[PDB]
Amino acid sequence: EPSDVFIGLKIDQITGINQKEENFSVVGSLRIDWRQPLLAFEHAPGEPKHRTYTLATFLKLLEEKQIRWPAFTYHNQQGAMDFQNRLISLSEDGTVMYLERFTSTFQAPAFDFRLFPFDNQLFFIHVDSIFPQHLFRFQEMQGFSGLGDQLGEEEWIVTEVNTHLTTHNEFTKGDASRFVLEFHAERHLNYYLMRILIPVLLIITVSWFTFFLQDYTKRIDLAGGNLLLFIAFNFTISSDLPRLGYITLMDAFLVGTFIITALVVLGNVWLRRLENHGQALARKLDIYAITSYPLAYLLGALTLWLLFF
Amino acid sequence: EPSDVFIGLKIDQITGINQKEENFSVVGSLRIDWRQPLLAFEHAPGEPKHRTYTLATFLKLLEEKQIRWPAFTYHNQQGAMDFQNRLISLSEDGTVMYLERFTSTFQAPAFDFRLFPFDNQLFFIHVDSIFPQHLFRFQEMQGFSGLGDQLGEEEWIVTEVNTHLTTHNEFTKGDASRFVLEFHAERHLNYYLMRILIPVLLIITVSWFTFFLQDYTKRIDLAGGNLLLFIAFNFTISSDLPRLGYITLMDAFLVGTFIITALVVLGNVWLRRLENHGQALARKLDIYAITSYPLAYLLGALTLWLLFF
Amino acid sequence: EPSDVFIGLKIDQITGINQKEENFSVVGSLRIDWRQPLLAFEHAPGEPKHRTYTLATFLKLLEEKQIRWPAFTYHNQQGAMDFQNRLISLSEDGTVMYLERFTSTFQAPAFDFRLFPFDNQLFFIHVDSIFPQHLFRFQEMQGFSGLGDQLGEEEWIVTEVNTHLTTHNEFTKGDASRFVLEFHAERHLNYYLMRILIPVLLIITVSWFTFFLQDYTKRIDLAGGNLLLFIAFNFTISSDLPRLGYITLMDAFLVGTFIITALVVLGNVWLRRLENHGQALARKLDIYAITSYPLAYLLGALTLWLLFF
Amino acid sequence: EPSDVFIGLKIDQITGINQKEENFSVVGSLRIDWRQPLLAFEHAPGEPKHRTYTLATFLKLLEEKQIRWPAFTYHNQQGAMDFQNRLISLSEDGTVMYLERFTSTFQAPAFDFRLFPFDNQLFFIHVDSIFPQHLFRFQEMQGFSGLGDQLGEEEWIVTEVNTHLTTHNEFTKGDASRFVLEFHAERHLNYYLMRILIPVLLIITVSWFTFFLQDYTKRIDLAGGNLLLFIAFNFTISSDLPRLGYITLMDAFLVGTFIITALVVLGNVWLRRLENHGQALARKLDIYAITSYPLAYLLGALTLWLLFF
Amino acid sequence: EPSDVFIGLKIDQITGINQKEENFSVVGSLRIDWRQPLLAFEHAPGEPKHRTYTLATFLKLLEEKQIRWPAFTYHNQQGAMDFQNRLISLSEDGTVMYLERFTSTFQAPAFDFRLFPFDNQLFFIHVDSIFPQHLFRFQEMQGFSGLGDQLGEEEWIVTEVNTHLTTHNEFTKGDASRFVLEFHAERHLNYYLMRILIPVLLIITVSWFTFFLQDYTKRIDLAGGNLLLFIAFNFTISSDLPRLGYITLMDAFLVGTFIITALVVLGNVWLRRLENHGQALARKLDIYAITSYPLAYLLGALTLWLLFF
Numbered sequence A, B, C, D, E: 001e002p003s004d005v006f007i008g009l010k011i012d013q014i015t016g017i018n019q020k021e022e023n024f025s026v027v028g029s030l031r032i033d034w035r036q037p038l039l040a041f042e043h044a045p046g047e048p049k050h051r052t053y054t055l056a057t058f059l060k061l062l063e064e065k066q067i068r069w070p071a072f073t074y075h076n077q078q079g080a081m082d083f084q085n086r087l088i089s090l091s092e093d094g095t096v097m098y099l100e101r102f103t104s105t106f107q108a109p110a111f112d113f114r115l116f117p118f119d120n121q122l123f124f125i126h127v128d129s130i131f132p133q134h135l136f137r138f139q140e141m142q143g144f145s146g147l148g149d150q151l152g153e154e155e156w157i158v159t160e161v162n163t164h165l166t167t168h169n170e171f172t173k174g175d176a177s178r179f180v181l182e183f184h185a186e187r188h189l190n191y192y193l194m195r196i197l198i199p200v201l202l203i204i205t206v207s208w209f210t211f212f213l214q215d216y217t218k219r220i221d222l223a224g225g226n227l228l229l230f231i232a233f234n235f236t237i238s239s240d241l242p243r244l245g246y247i248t249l250m251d252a253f254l255v256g257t258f259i260i261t262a263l264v265v266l267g268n269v270w271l272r273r274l275e276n277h278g279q280a281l282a283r284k285l286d287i288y289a290i291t292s293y294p295l296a297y298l299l300g301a302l303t304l305w306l307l308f309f
Ligand SMILES: CCCCCCCCCO[C@@H]1O[C@H](CO)[C@@H](O)[C@H](O)[C@H]1O
Pocket: A203, A206, A207, A210, A221, A222, A223, A224, A225, A226, A229, B220, B221, B222, B223, B224, B225, B227, B228, B265
C-alpha cells in the first residue's frame, strides 16, 4: 500500500520578482510529516521519546534500515537553494517530522506582459515526488501552507494564495504526486504613473502651450525633439521587460506617441507649405494647427483603449 | 523542565544597506552558552577539563548520546550565510560554549521611505528557537550583544541598539523563544545636498538670472529645457528606491518642480500673448514675469513643507 | 566486454541565453540506466527488491566492492553546476538507476552572428565518458531525452531537438563515448522591430518631411544631428553582442545609415554652394535635394540586401 | 603555560580595491608553526618523519587526542573565503606546519576620502586568536609575511608594508592575541588627470575663447550649458565614492566650478543690463566681461587650495 | 630520492578575458601521473588490476598508508575553482592517474595596455608543488597539455601556446617545482574600427563639409559640440580599461582630438577677430580656415604615429 507524505510549504519572504528574467525569489519553510512504522523504536525510562537528527545522519540511518524515503524535487527551482535548517524529529511511533528552511529562485513561466503595467501574474512552487503514487502519496499538511505576513515586496501586491495536489509523469511511466503552492500578484502603478505617465503627459501638454506663440518653425523643432524623447522613453521601458515576441499595452502606447508626433511634424510642415502657397489665411490655418494637436492625441488614446479594452 | 539557552549576537560590520532590495548585510558573531548535564564528563588528573569540538563532530556526539540541541533559525536571513567559525567548547560540567562567525544578508521589512531622504529606519536580526518554550528558553547572554566600533557604514549613522526576547509560533502551536537585536539608523544628507538639492537650486536660480535679459522666447525655451532636466533627475532618484506603491518626500519635491516649470512655460506663453494683444505695457508685463518665477517656487516649497510637516 | 550505459538528458528550463558571453543556462535532469551484475543482491521475503541510495554512500559501496562506475563529464559545462537531486535506485538484478537534477551554464561555441538579428543558432550539451569504449559504451536511453514544455524562454524559439552518440579522445588514445543533446533556436524579431527598425525609420522619414520647408541650413543641421543619433544606436547594438572580429548584418545596416547621412550633409552643402555660385535655379536645385534623400536610402537598402542575400 | 603560535601572512595578489564598498580583495597564504608535544610520534626505520594531513582528518585527530588547536578568525574578513589549500605537516617532534591559501574580501574601515584623489589609504588584515593569551600567544613567523611581487593592482601603488602583534578582547574578558598585516597605498592620478581635470579645463578654456567674439547672449548660453556639463561631471564623480557624510577635495572642486559658472551667468546678465541702460562704453564693459572669467576661476582655485592645504 | 610527478594541463574553453580586472577565465582539465610503489597492491585472478577512487577516499587511503601526496597550488588562481571531476585510477604498480576538470579565473598580471587596441598579451597558468624538489619533481606529461579547438573566444585570437617547467620558492627555502602553461593572444580590431574609429572620423569629416557654407559662428558652435562628443568618447574608452597609471595609444588619440578641436575653436575665433579688424580679405581668410582644419588633424595623426611607432 502507498504511505501518505504530508507536504506543507510556507513562503516567509519574497526577496524579489525579476520580470526581465521571469523568475521570483523566496525564503521558505518546507514541512513534512511521514509515518514509517519501520522507524519506530523502544525507549528506556528517562531516554527521550523523540530522537532529533541532522538530515545527513537520518538518511544514513534510512540506508542502514534499508528504508526508502519520499525523495522529492522542487520542479520549477532555478540555481542554488541556500539552506538554513534541515532537521528531522523521529517519534517512538515512527513519525518523521522534517523542516527545510531555504532561500531559492523559482521559474515564473506564467508571465503575460500583454496588459503591462496593468497586469496580474501567477507565481507557483511545484514540489514533486520522485517515486510514483503506488509507493508514496502527497497529502496536504493542514494549517501550515501559505504566505507570511512580512513578505517584504513593495511593487507587487499578493491578491490570493492556493494549495492543491496533482499528478506528474517526469521520471516515471505511472502518475507521481505533485504539491502546488500558487499565488497571484498585481502591480503597484505608482512608479509608472510618476516616472512614465506624468512626464509623457507633461511633455505633450507644455509642448502644446507653445502653439499659442504662433511660430511654425518652432513647432516643427519642438515636435522633432519630442519624438526623440519618446524614442528615449521607449528604451527606458524595453529595459524592464524581456525581449518579448509580442506587443505590450506599454509598447502600443509608445508607438502611438511616435505616430502622433510623426503626424504633428507632417501636419505643421504641410500647414507651413500652405502659408507659403497663398494674413487672415495665415491666422485661419493657425486654428487648424492648434486644434489638430489635442485631437490627434485624443484620437490615439481612443484607439489603444479600444484595441486593449 | 526547560533548559536556559544564552543567546548573544554582536554585529562587527555593516557591509552595506541595500535600500532598493530592502535588506542589509552584516559580519556578526553569535555566541551561545547552554548547560546540558547529560554532556558532562569525568577526566583524569592532567587530562583537559575543556573539550574543543568542530560543530560537525559535536552534533555527531549529541546524536550518539541521544541529546536534543537548541536548533535555531535566523528568521529574517536571506540567501547564503558564509561562515568563518563554528566552534564548541564543552566543560566537564556540560556547559556548551558556541561561537558562530558569519557574513549574511537580512531582510529589512521595516523600510518606510515616506520622508526620504530625511528618514530614520529600523533594522533587526531575529534568532528563533525551532523547539518551543517547554523544552528550551532563550535568555540574554549578558555583556556581549550589540554593534561593534568599526561597522564601516558611511551613509548611515546608527542612533541606538536594543536587545529583547519574545515568542514566535512559526513551526509549533505552543510559543517558542525569539532573540531580537534591533538598531535604528538615520541618513547622512551630504550626498543629497551635493548631488540633488544644490544642482536643482542652481538650475532654478541661474535660469532666473536670464529673465533680466528681457527675451520672452528665450525664457520659454529655458523653462522647457529645465522641465526635461527635472524629468532626468526624476529617473536618477527612482533608481535609488524600490518601485514603491506610495509617494516619497523626494517624489513630491520633483513633481513640484515639474508643476512649477509647466506653469512657468504657461505663464510666459500667456504674457507673450498679452504683449501681442495690445512699450510701457511691455515693460510693465515684464515685472510680472520676473517676479512670478521666484514666487511660484517659493509657493511650491511652502506647499510640500506643509503637506509633509 | 564493454557495459552499456544508458544516457538520457532532458532540459526542463532555459533560464537564459547570454549572447554577449556565448553561453546558455538550463535546468535539466540526467538519467542513467546501467546493469552491473556484481552489484546484484539477494533479499529475504519482506526486505525490499530495490535499494535506494544517496550518491555519496552508493559511490562508497562501489569503492568497497572494487567496482568502476561510468565516470562522465559535461564537456561544454561552465562554472558551477548547482545540484537538486543525485539519487540511485539499485535493483536485485544490479540495474543502477541514476537521476541527476541540476542548474548549469554551458558553452555555446556555435554562435554565428553574421545574419543577426535574422540568425538561427545551434546549442548543445556534451556528456562524455571518461573511460574508453572498450570498458563503457553510451547508449540512448529511449523515451526521456529532449526539451520540456515550459522552457520559459521569450526571445528565442526552439526550431528542433536532436540526440546522437559520437566518439571523443579527450583523456584517452582510444575512442570514448559522447552523448549529444542538440537544439536549434531562432530569434523573435519583435524587440528589434519596435526598438531599432521603427525608431531609425521614423527619424529618417520625419527628417525628410522638413525638406519641404525649403531651408538648406536647417537640413544640414538636421542630417548632422541624425548622424549623432545613429552613432548612439551603434553603441546600443554593440552592447548586445561580443566584440566580434566580423561584420554583422546589423553592423552593415548602421554603417549604411552613417554613409548615407554623411552624403546627405555633403550633398546639401554642395547644393547650397551651387545656389551661392549662380530663383528658378533655386527652386530647380531644391527638387534634387528633396528627391536625393529617398533615393540615397533606397540605394543603400539595395546595397546591403544584395551584400547579405 | 601558553604555547607560541607562529603566524605568517603573505598577500600574493590584490584582486582589487573597491572604494565604493570600502573593502579590498586579496589572494593570500597563511602559514602557522605550532609545537604541540602531545602530537609527537615515534617512527620505524623507513616510515616517514613527517606526517601529511588534510585539515579535516588532522582536526579529527586532535579531537581524538583531546587536544585544543589555536582556533583563529580573520577579524576584518567579509563574505566567503574561497580556499585553495589547507594542508598540515606534522613532524616527529609535534611541530604542526599549516598552510592556508585563500581568496577573500576584507573590510577597509580606514578609508579617508577627505583629500581624494590625492589620498593615501591604510589597508590591513586582522588575524585573531579565539582563545586568550594564557592558552596561546601569537608570535611573528619570521621571513614569510608581507606582499608579493605580482600584486596586479594598477590604480593603487603600495608605499609600505608592516607586521605587528596586539591584543583584542572580542570573545574573552582577558586579552587575546591578534596578528596585523598593514599596508599603505596611494593613488595613480593619471585617470583623474585624463578623464576629469583635462576635460573640465578644456571646457573652461575653449569657452573663454568665444568671449573674443563679442556676443553677450552667446556667452550667457555658453555658461548655462557649461553649468549642466559640470552637474553631469558631479554625478560621474559621485559614482566612484560611497555616499559620504563629509566633503571631498573633488566635491569642493566641482561645487567651485558651479559657483563660478553661476556668477559668470550673473555677471554677463548684469553687463548686458548695463549696456542696455546707457559704443566706447560697450567696448569698455566688454573688457570687464573678458577679464572677469579668468580671474573668477583663478580666485576659486586659490580658495580650495587654501581650504584644503 | 625525488619522485617524478607528470603534470598535464589543457584549456578547453576561454569563458572570457576581463581586461578591466586583468584576469581571464577558463574551463580546463588537469592530468597527473605519479608512480608511488608504496600504493602498489596484490590482486587475485579475476579481481581488478585498476582501482577507481573518488579523491576524498583516495586521500583518506594515503593518510592511512602514511604516504605524502604531491600537494600542488594554481599559483595565479583567483576566487572559487568550480570542479566537475576529481577522479583517481590506481594501478597494481602504484601508478596514480588523476584528472581534475574545473572552471576558474586566473590573474593576468602581464597586461600591457601601452599599444591598446593594437596590443598583444601574455596569459599563463602556474601549477606549483607545495613540497620542494628533493621530495617531488614536476615533469611534462607528454601529448596532453595545450589549448582546445572550441575555446569560444571571439575578441581575442591565440597566436601561440607553450609549456615549460621552472622553480619557485613560495613556501620553502629550497627550490620547488612549477609547471607553466603560457599563451599569447592579440585583439580583433573590428569592434574598435566600427564603434570608435569610423564614428570619430565621420564626425571630423562631415564637420569639415560645413566649412564650405562660409558661416564663422556656425563653425565655432560645431567645433565646440565636437569637443563635447570626444569628451564623451573619452569616457566610453576609459570604461574598457583599468584606471592605469600610464598613457594608452587610445588615450593619446583622444587627447589628440581634444587638442586639435580646442585649436580649431581658437583659430576660428582668431580668424573672425581678423575679419572684424580690417570682402576679398574675408574670402582670403576663409581659405585658411578651410585648409587649417585638415592640416591640423593630419599633423596630429603624424604626431601620435611617430610618438608610438
Ligand atoms: C521639451 C518640451 C518643452 C516644451 C516647451 C517649449 C520650450 C523649449 C523646450 O526645449 C526644447 O525642446 C525641444 C524638444 O525636446 C528640443 O528639440 C530643443 O532643442 C529644446 O531647446
